[PDB]
Amino acid sequence: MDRSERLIQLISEEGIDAFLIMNIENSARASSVYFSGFTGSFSIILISENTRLLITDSRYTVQAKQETDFEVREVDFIDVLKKTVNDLKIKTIALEEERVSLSLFRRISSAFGDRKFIGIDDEVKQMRMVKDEGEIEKIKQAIEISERAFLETVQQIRAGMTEKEIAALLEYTMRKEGAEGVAFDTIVASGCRSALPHGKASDKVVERGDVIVIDFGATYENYCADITRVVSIGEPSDEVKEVHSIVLEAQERALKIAKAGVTGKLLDSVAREFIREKGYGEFFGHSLGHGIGLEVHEGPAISFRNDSPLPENVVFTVEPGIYLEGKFGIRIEEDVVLKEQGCEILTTLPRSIFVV
Amino acid sequence: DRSERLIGIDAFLIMNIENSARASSVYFSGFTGSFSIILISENTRLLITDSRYTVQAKQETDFEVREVKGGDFIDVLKKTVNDLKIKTIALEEERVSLSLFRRISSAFGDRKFIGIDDEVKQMRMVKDEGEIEKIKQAIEISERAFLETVQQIRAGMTEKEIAALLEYTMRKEGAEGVAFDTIVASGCRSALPHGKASDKVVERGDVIVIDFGATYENYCADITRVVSIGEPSDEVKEVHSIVLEAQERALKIAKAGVTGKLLDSVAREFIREKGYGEFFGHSLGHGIGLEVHEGPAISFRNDSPLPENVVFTVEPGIYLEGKFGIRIEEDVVLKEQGCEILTTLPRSIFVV
Ligand SMILES: [Cl-]
Ligand SMILES: [Cl-]
Ligand SMILES: [Cl-]
Ligand SMILES: [Cl-]
Ligand code: NA
Ligand code: NA
Ligand code: NA
Ligand SMILES: [Zn+2]
């Protein structure tokens, strides 16, 4: 399926003839998926009234015909695309100028010298930021898959395994539960590595006593989950327990004020204020969260710098973190949907430390 | 080093945002994170990032690490270019969005920009020993996982199940990830040069082409081997023999100075003489490195003499529509008097 219909409605309202997506090496993967249903890394998509064209190479010709109801052409795509643009008398073309390189844009500009280009990045971003109930359903499914897999994987964790072996098991188990991919490189940060906010599962061997931050998420029907929980090999120290309690309380304070109209800045501020008055401000994470959907990193940004009022049905994460350099770190993350007078938490896993 | 080798341009600017310029960030600084604004000049090696990566960046690079603790990173960057009196800036304009270029243009105001994409690609095309070691490791992980996976293949499994098992095994064997989605094409689907893993069930007698590759420390492997549940037919054995002999003909003459055009031609000619010219692939190989597809292209169109230490694949194939296909792929490093084959897996059909 695809949402090309609402896109057509969008450009037609402004008299724009067509929308061009240039997905090369996944440069516009999410847009390609959202507007055509194609999940591949290469796709040149042209959408206009009564026109749905998708140009891709031999690696994806069959796939594109399976995933979309577009007219698929196999192919250097500029000359091929221009033929259609001219045959359909398309004069104005909308583009996502944040998703086209300067060099490619100059190539397109030179080839289409008699055309007018219109950046619609803001409109497309707003379109994707507010999820339909169908999308929220898919995100929830991805979360359900992720959580079931986590529960089956967590007790199998033990000293001697490498962080990558743990990540491997979790990812394969998500596939067992229905995941059709992984949303991002699973993070399994053990011991001192747990103090690194966003590293990745490494060859480091997990040791007894290790605090382990696990950030994971499956994809299902193209939508993503993003969950973070903490595991401890053996009973955690009182200090670890205390930092964990502060993180949990900070998260809950942000969740209590989340409602339509709130800004990412305000949400971030309540967690930030709570943590710093406890004396841990210098160890607080960079931002409180981010949006999710077709991607693990999309709007809205739940940070100190985002003062934009958030409308209902945006989907984002709430994940305060406290990292003590050279010692350990703690981060707990929920996925939520903003609603008119509060929010809807989609994650359900216990937030307590999983002691194994 | 690379930054020095790259060094009337005053500085080179890499703007890695949400991994938008990850390859270059990794190549020039060693940093593996998603956010890094790098400035390189004769007297400056600066990496700007935020608290998500400060400690990591200091562990991974010898660059001065600057953390943006407030405002927009563009303002810090602007402050830096002005303090350093940088007037002409080099960019990989294939790796900077139109919108981002507008933002820096307005911020720097007067600066002149020059694209150096071709020069950077030329640098990455010739690998140093450290890179080859990483590629070798990605290959070793890939091969160990392959041997463990083939012994678990069961008639009745789908191509996707085999692909998933192989990827899981690579991950547990140390892979950072996969270079590309594992391809498992069985039976008539093996005759599809680009046929991807599907729900098709693998049966006894099916030719199973498996194209896979793990990534290790950001470098990629790209291997293709053939598996068969039970002894393969005499025809499959014959076609496989021809593909292998064609591959050997190309590998035999591969050395610094040779052209991809000749390598492709010798493999193609052999296949044609054997009566399969109409079923030959389109290209003989492609380069590998921080990405699965990079220079040099081992095709009829590339007549440029290949220098020592380029790293590429040699993968001839014969595809018989409706029947089966055979492809065997090696990863090699070009040397002065020959080539170093990095892939060690036997090229014979793996009968399980
Ligand atoms: Cl409230
Ligand atoms: Cl603060
Ligand atoms: Cl509602
Ligand atoms: Cl310019
Ligand atoms: Na289960
Ligand atoms: Na509330
Ligand atoms: Na360092
Ligand atoms: Zn996260």
Q: Please tell me whether the peptide bond between A300 and the residue prior to it is cis, using omega within 30 degrees of 0.
A: yes
Gap between the Cα atoms of A250 and B273, Å rounded: 73
Provide the 8-state DSSP code for A272: H
Beta-ladder partners of A52: A47
Enter the tokens of residue B228.
Answer: 């068969």
Q: Which of A91, A89, A117 is nearest to A22 (CA)?
A: A117
Neighbouring C-beta atoms of residue B67, cutoff 10 Å:
19
A195 Cβ contact partners less than 8 Å away, ≥ 6 residues apart: A189, A323, A324, A325, A326, A327, A328, A329, B55
Provide the 8-state DSSP code for B202: P
Gap between the Cα atoms of A21 and A5, Å rounded: 15
Alpha-helical segments (H) within A37-179 = 61-67, 78-87, 102-111, 121-129, 133-154, 163-176
Kindly identify which residue of chain A lies nearest to residue B69, measuring between CA atoms: A286
Gap between the Cα atoms of A298 and B96, Å rounded: 19
Nearest to A165 among B33, B50, B172 (CB): B172
- Identity of the residue numbered A284: F
Beta-ladder partners of B329: B224
Q: Using an 8 Å Cβ cutoff, are A61 and A72 in contact? A: yes
Strand-strand pairing, B219-220 and B285-287: unpaired
Neighbouring C-beta atoms of residue A151, cutoff 10 Å:
13
Give the residue carrying structure tokens 């402050």. Answer: B79
A332 CA → ligand 2 middle, Å: 19
Three-state DSSP at B68 gives: coil
Q: Using an 8 Å Cβ cutoff, are A306 and A125 in contact? A: no
A55 Cβ contact partners less than 8 Å away, ≥ 6 residues apart: A43, A44, A45, A46, A72, A73, A74, A75, A77, A80, A81
Three-state DSSP at B259 gives: strand
Sequence ranges of the binding site of B for Zn(2+): 211, 222, 315, 329
B121 Cβ contact partners less than 8 Å away, ≥ 6 residues apart: B294, B295
Gap between the Cα atoms of B178 and B2, Å rounded: 26
B351 Cβ contact partners less than 8 Å away, ≥ 6 residues apart: B227, B228, B229, B230, B231, B232
Give the residue carrying structure tokens 């929220």. Answer: A136
Q: Using an 8 Å Cβ cutoff, are B317 and B332 in contact? A: no
Q: Using an 8 Å Cβ cutoff, are A97 and B98 in contact? A: yes
Q: Which of A239, A103, A245 is nearest to B116 (CA)?
A: A103
Gap between the Cα atoms of A47 and B177, Å rounded: 34
Q: What is the arrangement of strands in the sheet containing B112-115, beginning at the earlier edge strand?
A: B64-67, B45-49, B36-40, B11-16, B88-91, B112-115
Provide the 8-state DSSP code for A112: T
Gap between the Cα atoms of A210 and A203, Å rounded: 15
Give the residue carrying structure tokens 């194609």. Answer: A38
Chain A contact for B34 (CB, 8 A cutoff)? yes
Please give the domain boundaries of chain A with CATH numbers for all domains: 1-128 (3.40.350.10), 129-356 (3.90.230.10)
Enter the tokens of residue A102.
Answer: 């300067």
Neighbouring C-beta atoms of residue B8, cutoff 10 Å:
6
Q: Please tell me whether the peptide bond between B296 and the residue prior to it is cis, using omega within 30 degrees of 0.
A: yes
| B171-202 burial code (b ≥16 CB/10 A, e <16) | bbbbbbbbbbebbbbbbbbbbbbebbbbebeb
Gap between the Cα atoms of B214 and B331, Å rounded: 13
Gap between the Cα atoms of B107 and A295, Å rounded: 29
Gap between the Cα atoms of A335 and B114, Å rounded: 43
Which residues in chain B have their CB less than 8 angstroms from residue A94's CB?
none
- Identity of the residue numbered B265: S
Q: Using an 8 Å Cβ cutoff, are B345 and B143 in contact? A: yes
Gap between the Cα atoms of A340 and A265, Å rounded: 18
CB contact residues (below 8 A), chain A span 78-97, against chain B: 97
Enter the tokens of residue B206.
Answer: 């099916």
Three-state DSSP at A164 gives: helix
A198 CA → ligand 8 middle, Å: 8
Gap between the Cα atoms of A209 and A197, Å rounded: 20
Q: Using an 8 Å Cβ cutoff, are A36 and A66 in contact? A: no
Stated resolution in angstroms: 1.6
Half-sphere exposure of B331 (CA within 13 A, CB side): 31
Beta-ladder partners of B178: B214
Strand-strand pairing, B350-351 and B223-228: parallel
Three-state DSSP at B163 gives: helix
Burial-class residue B151 by CB neighbours within 10 Å (0-12, 13-18, 19+). exposed
Gap between the Cα atoms of A61 and B214, Å rounded: 25
Give the residue carrying structure tokens 């003489």. Answer: B273
Chain B contact for A99 (CB, 8 A cutoff)? yes
Q: Vertex B74, ends B32 and A280: CA angle to 5°?
A: 65
B123 Cβ contact partners less than 8 Å away, ≥ 6 residues apart: B2, B5, B6, B27
A133 Cβ contact partners less than 8 Å away, ≥ 6 residues apart: none
Chain A contact for B178 (CB, 8 A cutoff)? no
Give the residue carrying structure tokens 């309202």. Answer: A13
Gap between the Cα atoms of A231 and A154, Å rounded: 8
Phi and psi, residue A6, nearest 5°: -70, -25
Neighbouring C-beta atoms of residue A88, cutoff 10 Å:
16
